[PDB]
């Protein structure tokens, strides 16, 4: 069927430039106009730009007008978006989208969305996380169930992966979504409920992995 594949996203310092691409397949790309639409937690869904099938007419949102340039290569079936003078608030997930087919006098929007590529505009430098144990004790025990975890603090950028006992422990695991701090570093927690009768004897180790920095940390959580 119809398929759209975005590429080019990543971490970029403010003031620099970045070029996103969108590979289209399953249809005649040169016969359809295209949209770029971005989504952020602060603003929700937000349209960015539109281009005609032949590139003759282009439109941009007011917040990005004069900075972004949309283009296309119908011989390569590729859609491009050159983003210059990026600001911090441009951090979002960017989708390319295909205009639907309709009547000559109707209005138009998009029917098929791409996969999406994440763009994070921040002046923070790449930094590995600090892994601290959330040690269970009498104050974190209710009945026969206890809770333990790992705090993954002060890392940049996203994402990080957390496993327990090399993946052997998945029942009762809750990995919270990361939160962005005032320092531009992310932080999250991962918790797990275990039988209280196993505390002090069963070993629990959290394995944090960050491929962009090749960080691998195995932190053992011991009771107090």
């Amino acid at each position: 069927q119809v398929q759209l594949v975005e590429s080019g996203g990543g971490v970029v310092q403010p003031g620099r430039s970045l070029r996103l691409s969108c590979a289209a397949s399953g249809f005649t790309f040169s016969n359809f106009g295209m949209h770029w639409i971005r989504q952020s937690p602060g603003k929700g869904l937000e349209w960015v730009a539109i281009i005609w099938y032949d590139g003759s007419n282009t439109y941009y949102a007011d917040s990005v007008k004069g900075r972004f340039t949309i283009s296309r290569d119908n011989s390569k079936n590729t859609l491009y978006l050159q983003m210059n003078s990026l600001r911090a608030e441009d951090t979002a997930v960017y989708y390319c989208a295909k205009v639907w087919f309709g009547e000559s006098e109707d209005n138009y929007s998009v029917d098929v969305w791409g996969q999406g590529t994440t763009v994070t505009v921040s002046s923070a430098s790449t930094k590995g996380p600090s892994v601290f144990p959330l040690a269970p004790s009498s104050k974190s025990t209710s009945g026969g169930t206890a809770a333990l975890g790992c705090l993954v603090k002060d890392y940049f950028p996203e994402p990080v992966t957390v496993s327990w006992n090399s993946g052997a422990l998945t029942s009762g695991v809750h990995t919270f979504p990361a939160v962005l701090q005032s320092s531009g570093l992310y932080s999250l927690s991962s918790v797990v409920t275990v039988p209280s009768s196993s505390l002090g004897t069963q070993t629990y180790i959290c394995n944090v992995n960050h491929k962009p920095s090749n960080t691998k940390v195995d932190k053992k959580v011991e009771p107090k």
Partner: protein, 53 residues
């Protein structure tokens, strides 16, 4: 049985300000059949961006 020529010739403020649901719903044949000079002269952003085909 005639009309009082000195009666109220003004417009009753406490009259019916709503719309008349039984009024004329048809299209007026002898209405403005020409184009409007001060219509929209700008291109439509959400017009057809594809081929005919």
């Amino acid at each position: 049985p005639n009309a009082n020529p000195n009666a109220n010739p003004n417009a009753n403020p406490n009259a019916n300000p709503n719309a008349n649901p039984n009024a004329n719903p048809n299209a007026n044949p002898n209405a403005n059949p020409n184009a409007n000079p001060n219509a929209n002269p700008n291109a439509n952003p959400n017009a057809n961006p594809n081929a005919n085909p």
